[PDB]
User: Fold this.
Amino acid sequence: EEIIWESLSVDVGSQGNPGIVEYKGVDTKTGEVLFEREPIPIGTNNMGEFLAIVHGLRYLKERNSRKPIYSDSQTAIKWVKDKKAKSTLVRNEETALIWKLVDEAEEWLNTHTYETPILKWQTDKWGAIKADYGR
RNA sequence: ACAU
DNA sequence: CGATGT
Ligand SMILES: [K+]
Ligand SMILES: [K+]
Ligand SMILES: [Mg+2]
Ligand SMILES: [Mg+2]
Assistant:
């Protein structure tokens, strides 16, 4: 119903899918960019969406912040809930980097706790998530 | 079908 | 138009 403005919003951007993947997190209210991941040469949209949420969790925990995270990705929200990213991307030399990051994000989820609500951004009602790349 |  | 996902 109502946007929770006191929140962090995340989104992925890519050049190709699979292709070059980046992501960022912003203050939902103001749009201030709070973190941005260096582009990863080959990944999928959903791996990026998942890494963005997990980085948001780590960012908020380190800062003792109870803010929720918004993501527009049905898939990534579920992968985080499950602590398991069920990507189809082949494992090879060119995908080694993103798969290492995905593996390590799952490992972090499996070794830490958090109460952070992970909320679905309702794009149909509210427009594009505030972290969107505008691509 | 829904979400990207 | 194509791809990633539940
Ligand atoms: K975009
Ligand atoms: K589809
Ligand atoms: Mg998105
Ligand atoms: Mg977007």
Remarks:
- Residues 18 and 30 of chain A are 31 Å apart (CA to CA).
- Residues A 11, 132-133 surround magnesium ion (ligand 4) (CB under 6 Å).
- The radius of gyration of chain A is 14 Å.
- Helices of chain A lie at 45-62, 74-82, 96-109, 123-126.
